[PDB]
Write an enzyme that holds these catalytic residues in place. Sequence first.
Site, PDB file in Angstrom:
ATOM      1  N   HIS A 114       0.723  -1.251   0.000  1.00  0.00           N
ATOM      2  CA  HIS A 114       0.000   0.000   0.000  1.00  0.00           C
ATOM      3  C   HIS A 114       0.765   1.323   0.000  1.00  0.00           C
ATOM      4  O   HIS A 114       0.174   2.361  -0.300  1.00  0.00           O
ATOM      5  CB  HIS A 114      -1.000  -0.010   1.141  1.00  0.00           C
ATOM      6  CG  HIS A 114      -1.991   1.101   1.072  1.00  0.00           C
ATOM      7  ND1 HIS A 114      -3.086   1.064   0.237  1.00  0.00           N
ATOM      8  CD2 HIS A 114      -2.061   2.276   1.740  1.00  0.00           C
ATOM      9  CE1 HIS A 114      -3.789   2.171   0.397  1.00  0.00           C
ATOM     10  NE2 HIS A 114      -3.190   2.923   1.302  1.00  0.00           N
ATOM     11  N   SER A 118       0.972  -1.126  -6.485  1.00  0.00           N
ATOM     12  CA  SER A 118       1.368  -2.316  -7.216  1.00  0.00           C
ATOM     13  C   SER A 118       2.232  -1.882  -8.405  1.00  0.00           C
ATOM     14  O   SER A 118       2.360  -0.677  -8.697  1.00  0.00           O
ATOM     15  CB  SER A 118       0.126  -3.076  -7.681  1.00  0.00           C
ATOM     16  OG  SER A 118       0.309  -4.477  -7.557  1.00  0.00           O
ATOM     17  N   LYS A 159     -12.756  -7.176 -12.504  1.00  0.00           N
ATOM     18  CA  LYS A 159     -11.769  -7.975 -13.204  1.00  0.00           C
ATOM     19  C   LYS A 159     -11.260  -9.106 -12.294  1.00  0.00           C
ATOM     20  O   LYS A 159     -10.940 -10.196 -12.766  1.00  0.00           O
ATOM     21  CB  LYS A 159     -10.611  -7.088 -13.662  1.00  0.00           C
ATOM     22  CG  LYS A 159      -9.538  -7.815 -14.444  1.00  0.00           C
ATOM     23  CD  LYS A 159      -8.453  -6.862 -14.860  1.00  0.00           C
ATOM     24  CE  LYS A 159      -7.415  -7.570 -15.704  1.00  0.00           C
ATOM     25  NZ  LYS A 159      -6.268  -6.696 -16.120  1.00  0.00           N
ATOM     26  N   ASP A 160     -11.170  -8.850 -10.993  1.00  0.00           N
ATOM     27  CA  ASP A 160     -10.709  -9.881 -10.066  1.00  0.00           C
ATOM     28  C   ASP A 160     -11.765 -10.971 -10.043  1.00  0.00           C
ATOM     29  O   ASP A 160     -11.451 -12.158  -9.921  1.00  0.00           O
ATOM     30  CB  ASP A 160     -10.508  -9.311  -8.654  1.00  0.00           C
ATOM     31  CG  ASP A 160      -9.163  -8.591  -8.480  1.00  0.00           C
ATOM     32  OD1 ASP A 160      -8.558  -8.110  -9.473  1.00  0.00           O
ATOM     33  OD2 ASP A 160      -8.705  -8.490  -7.322  1.00  0.00           O
ATOM     34  N   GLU A 166       3.916 -34.742  -0.803  1.00  0.00           N
ATOM     35  CA  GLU A 166       2.812 -34.091  -1.478  1.00  0.00           C
ATOM     36  C   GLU A 166       3.475 -33.400  -2.700  1.00  0.00           C
ATOM     37  O   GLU A 166       4.659 -33.033  -2.655  1.00  0.00           O
ATOM     38  CB  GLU A 166       2.143 -33.091  -0.520  1.00  0.00           C
ATOM     39  CG  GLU A 166       1.705 -33.684   0.859  1.00  0.00           C
ATOM     40  CD  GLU A 166       2.847 -33.808   1.930  1.00  0.00           C
ATOM     41  OE1 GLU A 166       3.553 -34.860   1.942  1.00  0.00           O
ATOM     42  OE2 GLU A 166       2.999 -32.878   2.782  1.00  0.00           O
TER      43      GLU A 166
END
Lengths: 93, 385, 385, 53, 125, 245, 62
Positions: free
Chosen positions: B202, B206, B228-229, B272
């Site tokens: 923040h 980004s 969009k997310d 795994e």
Amino acid sequence: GPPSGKTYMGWWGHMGGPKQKGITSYAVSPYAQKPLQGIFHNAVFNSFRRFKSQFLYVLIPAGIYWYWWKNGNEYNEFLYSKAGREELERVNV
Amino acid sequence: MAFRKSNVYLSLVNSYIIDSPQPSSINYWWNMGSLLGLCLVIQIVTGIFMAMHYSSNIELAFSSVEHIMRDVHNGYILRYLHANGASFFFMVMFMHMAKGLYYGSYRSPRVTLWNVGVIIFTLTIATAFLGYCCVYGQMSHWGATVITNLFSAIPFVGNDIVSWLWGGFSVSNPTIQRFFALHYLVPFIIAAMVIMHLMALHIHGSSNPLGITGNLDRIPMHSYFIFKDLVTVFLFMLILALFVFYSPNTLGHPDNYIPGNPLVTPASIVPEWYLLPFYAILRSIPDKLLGVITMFAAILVLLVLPFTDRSVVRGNTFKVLSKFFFFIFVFNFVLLGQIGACHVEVPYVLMGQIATFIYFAYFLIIVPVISTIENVLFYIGRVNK
Amino acid sequence: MAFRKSNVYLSLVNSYIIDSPQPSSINYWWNMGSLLGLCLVIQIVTGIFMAMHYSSNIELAFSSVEHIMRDVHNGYILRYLHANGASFFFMVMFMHMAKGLYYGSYRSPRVTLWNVGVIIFTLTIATAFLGYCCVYGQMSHWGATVITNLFSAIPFVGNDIVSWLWGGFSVSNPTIQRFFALHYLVPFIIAAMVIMHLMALHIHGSSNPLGITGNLDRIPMHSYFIFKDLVTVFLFMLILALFVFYSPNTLGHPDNYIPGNPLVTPASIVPEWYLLPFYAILRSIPDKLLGVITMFAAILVLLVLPFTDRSVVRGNTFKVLSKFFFFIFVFNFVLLGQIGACHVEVPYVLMGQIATFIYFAYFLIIVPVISTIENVLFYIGRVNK
Amino acid sequence: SSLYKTFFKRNAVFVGTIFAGAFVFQTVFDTAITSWYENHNKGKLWKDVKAKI
Amino acid sequence: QSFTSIARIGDYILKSPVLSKLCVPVANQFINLAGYKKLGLKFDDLIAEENPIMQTALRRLPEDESYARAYRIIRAHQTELTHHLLPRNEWIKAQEDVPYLLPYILEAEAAAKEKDELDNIEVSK
Amino acid sequence: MTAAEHGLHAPAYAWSHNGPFETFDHASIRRGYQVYREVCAACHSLDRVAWRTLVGVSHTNEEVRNMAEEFEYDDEPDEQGNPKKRPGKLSDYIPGPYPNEQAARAANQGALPPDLSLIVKARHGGCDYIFSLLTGYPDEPPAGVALPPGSNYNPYFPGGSIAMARVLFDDMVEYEDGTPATTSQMAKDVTTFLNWCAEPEHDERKRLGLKTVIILSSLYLLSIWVKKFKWAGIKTRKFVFNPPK
Amino acid sequence: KSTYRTPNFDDVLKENNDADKGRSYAYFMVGAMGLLSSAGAKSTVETFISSMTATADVLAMA
Ligand code: HEC
Ligand code: HEC
Ligand code: HEC
Ligand code: HEC
Ligand code: HEC
Ligand SMILES: C/C=C(C)/C=C/C=C/C(OC)[C@@H](C)[C@H](OC)[C@@H](C)CCc1oc2c(O)c(OC)cc(OC)c2c(=O)c1C
Ligand SMILES: C/C=C(C)/C=C/C=C/C(OC)[C@@H](C)[C@H](OC)[C@@H](C)CCc1oc2c(O)c(OC)cc(OC)c2c(=O)c1C
């Protein structure tokens, strides 16, 4: 609340970029636009032009590795087979 | 001024989800973050609801899970969703990390963001291991054994750290009951680590695919990225739905359907899937101490990147040699995992070691060398003095 | 600019615990805040450690707790600390609530602060009752029973909500296992709820005993209140140690050392000491539904306070009639809790009813009526127009 | 489309109208799937094996 | 890495006709392969600016080169977000792909180098 | 690793239930119970399957109650605390043949027959492996294969040596519905049964899967179309530059 | 280039004969998305809630 350290991003009105002058932008309302087209006819031959440029940085490496795996996997299959059991004893221990 | 803006609580939201200035050009790779957020929720929720039927007890453990599987209404959906969610958590995380390497998100002023991210990565791998133990199937017990034993490598106190973790003479009731408690706890610590991750994000915002400043053209997070997310959210759910309902155990291991047994380690014991590349690295070093040190190093070497990257520009979009070598790195990671899956046999051993070399070499040799070369290539390619 | 100020994480720590401007005159009642913070930690830490040995399974529940007392090293110290730490949490919470109720902290701009605090009260009581059930002693079982049944009072869906919670025909294994699950979860929510309480505190700062503005004379949180807080921290630990080591069970109920039994409610059943006043209010209403509505109301009525206090000045420091009626409320509250520990017998029933009236009448009648009079009294006592 | 302008008249669908419709769907949609599914698996189901008894 | 460093290595190459005739071609191809010109950007627009030196530079840049650079960057983002490339004729022709910010950078760098040196200068009696 | 150790890969048989839209064949499940009760149940437990779980899947409420009552289970001691037995009930779990492990190995050359409740899920191959293992017992080990006393050869099992002999033989069971109980017809049945035992949620799950995939698919498509609409303004946007004087 | 000379949007600008087309399509989509989501939410919620209601093995009718 006290003041914090200076950053490289402000907020609306003082984002902290260079003084902009001369650039003029025009835009239109989504309501006034063709009910979502662009797909096919105009941007179908345009699509996939990306990854036709990049696909080599992806393919060459994939190829190098998939080949290396396959090749190395066959040698395994051979060593543990009847035929290679003589060579297997050589390179094992 | 608007309420969402003036209110103490709502404002935090407004400045993180509503008015947050985004670079107009961020692509779908930037959608990985919200997806990891969703995974955390899914995991946490499905988990708390199963805890209501689970038994930490070494005797009741495996059976209580089978109880969730048969008697609890929609139980199977909860288990298959937790189990497959973990695997999807890692797929999306790797992608989030990959996006980081490629776009040089780690450098610039976003270092702390990166470093916190690495911590999270370590915390998640831990959390998942603890959870895997709670089932107490063959893979559980042995994984529990092998992994806690990683600490016996510590010089003197080493064996003490181990019998301390176990709380006994071997992995037993004390170890499972405690690992359940820990498994419940860590996720909240992760959530906590996530807020710090967001806090660092923040202050500098980004990044974008070009690798340059975004300040000249931003668009509010809201009425754009919220929608969009949502595209990737729905897709993410769809693909998970497919596994949870039509292929629930593909991503798992069969041995984990046989209760744990202290006197028998299955000849088919295998980690795994998301732990394999690491498992592969440890297996390549033929010494106990070095194998474990080299493995942890494989994780920590991620911290070294903001320094070895000698480039004067951010991201791989305009670098040729970079893109190529970046892809040599990604596949080498996959090949590394492929190796961990195979047996310790003649063609594969040497391969594992070479691949391991390449992995470490990318961070300490390739990136610093290529980045320097590309820097000059850029200079001499347009300079006339 | 200094680092403690410039860093994204330390600036938070800095503006809250180091540079935070405090009113020079705040007394020791302002020390209750940090004490609660400590309490939350003691509970959480002790809990997680005990959880490594606990078994929620109804047949194993009570014994796992004894296993903690008898076999776990310092297990008794862990248990006695958690149990007593629970009571101290309330002794302090009550004081913290009282101080504010007295000094009018629920007023002016601090309402949201007070409202968040009320939620934390409801949540803490809930967390506490969830944990009390985990021992599965006689008190546990019956507390579990009665309280869940409080919801069977809801008109139509009633019984359904109740059997939903139980997860069976009655309080059995499903109930105790989901109750542990939830007892682990809420604390983390309380913690979240606390950070909001803090954010709401932080925009206006604390008030002070004079009830006037503290803007003219401030002194940083660090090296004053950090050390002043230390005094009470130690004092607090000293008394908690006296109970944990020399009188661990004085604050408890003996019936809880007898394993819970579904066919026999002991004639000695009595709620935890901190729940008594509320228990009493419910008993004082001979109607099932009204009994629970009134009880819940007794908690919700605290939200009314910022509207019924008509005074033009904040706090009780300079109000003769208010200071009087305040203590009448305090003792009334204690009498209420005393009636609760008593039987349902002749003089006590009526007493309980008169006090319940007083309790509610305090927030609804006394305060507004009294404060209006004091406003006028303050005026005519010096106006010669 | 003129079908939207008659039903909702150039105004977005209301949140109350959404929920109301959401309920209808739940039942309608479900029965449809349940049926198609049972039919497709005819002869295998318990209802079918129970009749041959 | 410093530009004082990049410019050091680069010039040395650019001077000795042996390295010159051998590298400049690779470099020209590397650049045309990079693809930035296709977004209407000059290399100097790519230089990461989140540091004192670059910040110093950008401020010292004459008004006109700045407004121009501003446009170029925005244009790049709009094109990229539309997933196309600018019409071929709008591509930066190699002759325009000038290191316009560079002189300012180097000036700033060496200025910093000195300040740094004068802060730790030892004394010898 | 030598193929003999990896085991012969089980082939892909066409299971009536392999398929996103396919349910188990409850007809086969029923016959499966029988093959289990008459042949497998003498050495294999089914500890995780409670009687009631058959009701409405392979048999009827009465039929199950009847199969259950044939076994005795421990009941609460009487007035004076004397342990007494009781006929099974629907809420119970299918009783195993051995009271404990030591006793199971005594009756099996020292080997322990796994509980078959999750066998289909505890093995790579699942139905295909269980089925193949059952049918593929060659009458004689290949040349050179020396077998340990009391052991049996079967190519599908890893290492080829398996402690369980062959148990399925033509017509050994008399199917209620008149189906030819050939050794393979049975294997097909028990396997299907064992599959339901391990995956009872089966049919119900694939049905919900269909509802989920449809709905989410629509939400995905819809969402793409919605995103484009909102982003239209920005996507089509245009810029023009005029260098200020 | 003069600022009053608006660029060409004839590649995206719809040739109107049904003015409320873009709107009718968008709102249906949005509304349809909303419909299915409430349903999916109602469904998710009910799944979890009902996972608390009495388990199969405890409904033992004595
Ligand atoms: C006792 C004589 C048995 C009868 C009758 C049946 N089984 Fe069995 N089974 C038995 C033994 C000794 C073992 C141990 C095998 C080993 O060496 O580990 C088994 C094992 C199985 C397995 C597991 C195979 C594996 O991968 O380990 C299966 C799937 C199995 N048995 C199936 C099966 C069925 C369906 C039967 C009835 C037709 C059956 N068994 C009968 C002993 C005995
Ligand atoms: C109680 C809260 C709880 C939380 C929070 C939680 N889990 Fe679990 N988890 C469980 C329970 C109960 C089990 C055991 C039953 C099971 O296997 O699902 C489990 C099992 C697991 C398993 C075993 C997988 C399997 O089912 O075979 C993994 C892996 C796992 N958790 C991963 C995670 C991850 C990663 C997160 C996210 C941080 C997480 N868990 C958070 C409760 C939780
Ligand atoms: C899992 C972590 C955990 C957390 C977090 C936790 N508890 Fe507990 N709590 C337990 C366990 C385990 C028990 C049972 C053992 C015991 O009685 O101490 C318990 C028991 C209790 C009891 C019963 C008293 C008694 O007889 O011992 C109370 C009251 C209690 N908790 C209060 C609290 C309160 C209030 C908080 C939070 C402010 C809290 N607990 C947080 C685990 C926790
Ligand atoms: C070590 C890698 C790494 C890990 C692990 C990681 N992140 Fe990130 N995260 C970053 C970096 C670096 C960025 C900045 C990326 C950019 O925009 O250039 C970032 C950005 C984000 C963003 C913004 C969206 C985006 O993808 O850019 C969110 C939200 C986020 N991360 C959430 C999370 C969550 C939630 C987790 C884990 C539970 C997580 N991150 C784990 C490195 C990491
Ligand atoms: C019913 C109300 C209420 C409850 C319960 C409550 N608070 Fe408060 N709290 C207040 C109010 C109002 C203030 C402001 C009083 C003032 O400073 O004048 C306050 C102030 C504080 C302060 C500052 C120091 C002090 O005592 O003034 C802290 C820290 C604090 N609370 C912590 C907590 C924590 C931690 C809890 C419980 C886990 C809690 N509060 C529960 C009402 C409450
Ligand atoms: C309370 C917490 C405690 C005690 C400690 C937890 C932290 C440990 C980790 O780091 C987070 C750890 C997960 C590690 O990271 C270095 C991973 C890469 C794991 C790598 C790993 O997995 C295996 C595994 O899963 C197995 O299962 C069947 C079996 C295994 O042997 C065959 C392995 C194994 O040989 C290795 C190296
Ligand atoms: C998962 C969470 C669930 C289902 C619900 C929890 C929430 C409920 C509460 O509020 C938070 C609740 C604690 C209540 O609040 C009104 C308290 C004041 C308690 C009042 C209370 O206690 C008793 C108690 O402890 C007893 O011990 C043996 C016995 C009791 O009579 C025999 C009582 C009792 O008669 C009452 C009214």
